[PDB]
């Protein structure tokens, strides 16, 4: 399995490195891919040092240990996309595996902290034997957040469903995360929190019955 950081930001004309980690990388090289929304992926680098014709020289791949890295020197606005690493899953394996992907944002706007609003289950919904917490995240840049739901201070994993962030009209991104609970589960606890982390800062909103 190959692991990549989900988000990376770079300023215009600067240098950034996206790194992929995995056990199989100690035996095999990694190919690197760029995918833009609504567009086919593009192979950027493969093998030890192999760059396809048409790929600008400012892209370059390196590898050491269990790590394979892609470097972009002098980043341009056209470099904003998702980047994926691919390799064998196991040494000598016949299969191939992709990495989680890394959203590279080339900064085009000031960094914006997310606005968060947490909504408890509506009374009518509870009368229908359902409970849905709605956490709404808007007005943030760059478009990458992590959402952690907590019942009291105990982490909650079941019932969570989160959308991938998408650009609003005001040029920033917006996302939503829904926690579905049984009506009994909502009544039992003192509080249910929605915590949104973005660029190293965490915002917490809390609801209670």
């Amino acid at each position: 399995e190959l692991t990549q950081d989900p988000a990376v930001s770079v300023a215009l004309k600067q240098t950034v490195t996206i790194t992929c980690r995995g056990d199989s990388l100690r035996s095999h090289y990694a190919s690197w891919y760029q995918k833009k929304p609504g567009q086919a992926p593009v192979l950027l680098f493969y093998g030890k040092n192999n760059r396809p014709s048409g790929i600008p020289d400012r892209f370059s791949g390196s590898a050491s240990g269990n790590r394979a890295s892609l470097t972009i020197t002098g980043a341009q606005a056209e470099d904003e996309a998702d980047y994926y690493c691919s390799s064998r899953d196991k040494s000598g394996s016949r299969l191939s595996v992709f990495g989680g992907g890394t959203k590279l944002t080339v900064l085009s706007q000031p960094k914006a902290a997310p606005s968060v609003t947490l909504f408890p289950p509506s009374s009518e919904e509870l009368q229908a034997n359902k409970a849905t917490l709605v956490c709404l995240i808007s007005d943030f840049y760059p478009g990458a957040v992590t959402v952690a739901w907590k019942a009291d201070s105990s982490p909650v994993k079941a019932g969570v469903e989160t959308t991938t962030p998408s650009k609003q009209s005001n040029n920033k991104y917006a996302a939503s995360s829904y926690l579905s609970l049984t009506p009994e589960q909502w009544k039992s606890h003192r509080s249910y929190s929605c915590q949104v982390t973005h660029e190293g800062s965490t915002v917490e909103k809390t609801v209670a019955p």
Partner: protein, 224 residues
């Protein structure tokens, strides 16, 4: 000059079947290794499988989560590749890519020393998996505790739904968010308007939800 076109996308119920076709041009297709890759919407890429040419015995490999259900075949006389999807599940949604695959080969080491890479990709074909065919939404009020109130639209298929507030009179501060597909295969979304706390009651706010495929219109007032 190298062109790959995927086709066969559509909606299939769980347990159903569907064949994707990927037509190739501008290269010697008879020898090229071909790989299927899929991307769940808003998620990353997943390697599905690869089929080799006649020289390698038509050897095919499948990802673990897909083995036994999908079959890869090809018609070199027609320059097409097929992904045969059977016992299809909800996780199979939805964007499927065929890729021209290169590989390292050495006579002593075979292929075990090297890796594969997909030098060209098609644009993709979308496969949606869900038992639902047409389902109107349920609408619930998100009451205010700057204040914020909105509506919750739940359990509809297919997209789109359109949310307007006060029959289009209210547009400032309105923010309808993108929908989300649940594991059930249904969509839910929320639209919220943010107003100062003082004005919360002086004006009444009603959201208008319009799901055209099920031919439903829902109007729901929001009260504190």
């Amino acid at each position: 000059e190298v062109r790959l076109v995927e086709s066969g996308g559509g909606l299939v119920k769980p347990g159903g079947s569907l064949r994707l076709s990927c037509s190739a041009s501008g290269f010697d297709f008879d020898n090229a290794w071909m790989t299927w890759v899929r991307q769940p919407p808003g998620k990353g890429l997943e390697w599905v499988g690869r089929i080799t040419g006649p020289g390698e015995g038509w050897s095919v490999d499948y990802a673990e989560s897909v083995k036994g259900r999908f079959t890869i075949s090809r018609d070199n006389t027609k320059n097409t590749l097929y992904l045969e999807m059977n016992n299809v599940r909800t996780e199979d949604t939805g964007y499927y890519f065929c890729a021209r695959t290169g590989k390292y080969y050495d006579f002593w080491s075979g292929y075990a020393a090297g890796e594969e890479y997909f030098q060209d990709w098609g644009q993709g074909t979308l496969v949606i998996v869900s038992s639902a065919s047409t389902k109107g939404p349920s609408v619930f009020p998100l009451a205010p505790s700057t204040a914020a109130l909105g509506c919750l639209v739940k359990d509809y298929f297919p997209e789109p739904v359109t949310v307007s507030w006060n029959s289009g009179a209210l547009t400032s501060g309105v923010h309808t968010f993108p929908a989300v597909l649940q594991s059930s295969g249904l969509y839910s979304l929320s639209s919220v308007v943010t107003v100062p706390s003082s004005s919360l009651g002086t004006q009444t706010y009603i959201c208008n939800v319009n799901h055209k495929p099920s031919n439903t219109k829902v109007d729901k007032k929001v009260e504190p």
